[PDB]
Design a protein around this ligand. Sequence first.
Ligand SMILES: *[C@@H]1O[C@H](CO[C@@H]2O[C@@H](C)[C@@H](O)[C@@H](O)[C@@H]2O)[C@@H](O[C@@H]2O[C@H](CO)[C@@H](O[C@@H]3O[C@H](CO[C@H]4O[C@H](CO)[C@@H](O)[C@H](O)[C@@H]4O)[C@@H](O)[C@H](O[C@H]4O[C@H](CO)[C@@H](O)[C@H](O)[C@@H]4O)[C@@H]3O)[C@H](O)[C@H]2NC(C)=O)[C@H](O)[C@H]1NC(C)=O
Ligand SMILES: *[C@@H]1O[C@H](CO)[C@@H](O)[C@H](O)[C@H]1NC(C)=O
Ligand SMILES: *[C@@H]1O[C@H](CO)[C@@H](O)[C@H](O)[C@H]1NC(C)=O
Ligand SMILES: *[C@@H]1O[C@H](CO)[C@@H](O)[C@H](O)[C@H]1NC(C)=O
Lengths: 307, 307
Amino acid sequence: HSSDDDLLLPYTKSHGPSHSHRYVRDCQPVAHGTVTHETQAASKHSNSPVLESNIFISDITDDSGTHRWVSGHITEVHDPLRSVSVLEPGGPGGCAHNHRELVEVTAKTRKCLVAQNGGYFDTHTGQCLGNIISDGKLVRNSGGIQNAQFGIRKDGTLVFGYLSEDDILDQENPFVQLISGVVWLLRKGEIYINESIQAECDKTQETGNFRHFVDVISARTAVGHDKEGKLILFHVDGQTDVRGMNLWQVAKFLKDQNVMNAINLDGGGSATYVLNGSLASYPSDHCNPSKWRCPRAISTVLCIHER
Amino acid sequence: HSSDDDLLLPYTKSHGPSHSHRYVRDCQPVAHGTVTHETQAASKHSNSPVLESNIFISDITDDSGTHRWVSGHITEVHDPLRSVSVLEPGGPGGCAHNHRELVEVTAKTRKCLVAQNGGYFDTHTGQCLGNIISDGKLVRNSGGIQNAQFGIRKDGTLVFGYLSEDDILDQENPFVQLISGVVWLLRKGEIYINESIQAECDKTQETGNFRHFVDVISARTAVGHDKEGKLILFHVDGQTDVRGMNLWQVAKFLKDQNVMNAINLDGGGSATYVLNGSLASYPSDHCNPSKWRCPRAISTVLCIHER
Ligand SMILES: *[C@@H]1O[C@H](CO[C@@H]2O[C@@H](C)[C@@H](O)[C@@H](O)[C@@H]2O)[C@@H](O[C@@H]2O[C@H](CO)[C@@H](O[C@@H]3O[C@H](CO[C@H]4O[C@H](CO)[C@@H](O)[C@H](O)[C@@H]4O)[C@@H](O)[C@H](O[C@H]4O[C@H](CO)[C@@H](O)[C@H](O)[C@@H]4O)[C@@H]3O)[C@H](O)[C@H]2NC(C)=O)[C@H](O)[C@H]1NC(C)=O
Ligand SMILES: *[C@@H]1O[C@H](CO)[C@@H](O)[C@H](O)[C@H]1NC(C)=O
Ligand SMILES: *[C@@H]1O[C@H](CO)[C@@H](O)[C@H](O)[C@H]1NC(C)=O
Ligand SMILES: *[C@@H]1O[C@H](CO)[C@@H](O)[C@H](O)[C@H]1NC(C)=O
């Protein structure tokens, strides 16, 4: 569909770090003890609408003193357990076929009110990446790859952070939704990017390219939660090294929206915001072969649907 | 609905100029003869889709040498006669009730594939402005107010330019759609703003405010056609004196898109692009009372619907 020309790649070769969850615990800062994740009971506002979606057009400043206009959406979800779903591309079984699909197409399979692009994927093979649990079904076990995680448990517990392979296979209170990103933006209402860089990039990888992935501006998406337990979906349009935000700016932006924990999902040309099946953002990838903009065929999708 | 705080008003009092169509004809350049409008047989591609919608994100330069990013939509219509409709706000009878309504609401009354804000209106009273013909019904006769016009005739003829009161009341080949804007951007593939300034503003209006309305950057919408007879719908997001384009920039942009004739419709906080009933642009008005952005309650709507 698109030319795939706005690539925002955190890893030059193999996705994710090579070291184990135990290593993440050992390098993690003393302030957090030995637990490498955060939990929050999801809100249960059964008397509210499913969601509230807001458009922002904001003036962002960076350490250079430079000002930039940015535009995007913040989406608040009032009953995450009953309305949030991780979808495979195109429908159930998509990841098994290395299928890539537009967000709007995947979104129409479940009548999503708001849908955004989800996790990372191989742009050459279409292979899905990270851990994936869709509507209680386990879709992909990364094998303990230490990337920022977001999941919902059967009892409504929201989960953010780093999870071991055994964490996601637990049957006592099983995950019903699970998706992986890259970089833990906020932990306990504080910026956590430096810690993420140490945990999600290892000695055998070039930390420079990864730090550049963190520092460069581009289109970005993120998911988090607030003090009330509502789920926060973040999206900002951009183009790598031209428009949008870097992760430091996203973290500060969300921190000033009372977001307590959030992880960064796929961005660049993948960032998409679909409103009721209709593309409602400006993607960065050029079309094949025009200079028009085209949304990218991506992998998993974050869907917010009727309860 | 919105705070209505991004106002882009061409006239300080009343609306339109006071001089007659005869006066406009006499000032027109000899290169165009004595006819003050352009015609084009609408395309009849019954074997094509209804429309094609494209997103642009373009680098615009102004006489200051400064570069700015702009984003919006170009929409091509393949059977304008059977798929394009001028709608009253909220539905038939709206203009008589000084009703204002969101584009998405008015658009859902006719299952519009693409809908944009249409003509100008009084922001205090809700009064509709200009000539208005909706689905063959005459809605409002301005009385010969000389503003840029766009209309479709019963036999498919697309009409752009300045029309006398008798022109629109003709029954030989009656207008089935008609709407009024402000400023004729392109005539015969050439920029026509200078001529429009002479025709659509006279001494009884604040000429300063009008020239500022032309020169300032803001959100803008426009409608035009190409040699193939397709209808071209233009929209660019912005905010008066901060983001977007001025009419000089809109005109050049369309001229480089093989547009042959085009007029400027309502802009600023009114500029809206609704895709299949879903808001698919970033409006400029702030919400009441948050700092989020809200679409504006407007008057007439340009609707592209099933054949
Ligand atoms: C349509 O009308 C245009 C004028 O309309 C008004 O201005 C606009 C911007 C609105 O405000 C509108 O509401 C007004 O009614 C008219 O624009 C003019 O077009 C001519 C071309 O024929 C341009 O000529 C060049 O002028 C510059 C000077 O401009 C600079 O300095 C002045 C200082 O007074 C500033 O006001 C301007 O903003 C600029 O900063 C000359 O430097 C230039 O000559 C030099 O360059 C050429 C080649 O590069 C050489 O050959 C020369 O020897 C010189 O080296 C041109 O003479 C003029 O700038 C422009 N005016 C404005 C304000 O932009 C337009 O031409 C009309 N269209 C038609 C088809 O007639
Ligand atoms: C993160 O580390 C970088 C230098 O490596 C620098 O911005 C600062 O020391 C740290 N900032 C935060 C917010 O942790
Ligand atoms: C979503 O789109 C469908 C078809 O485009 C429409 O019928 C439905 O009303 C929309 N949903 C909402 C909540 O407006
Ligand atoms: C628009 O809605 C119609 C339903 O009438 C649907 O058939 C079509 O696929 C939709 N197109 C887009 C781009 O959403």
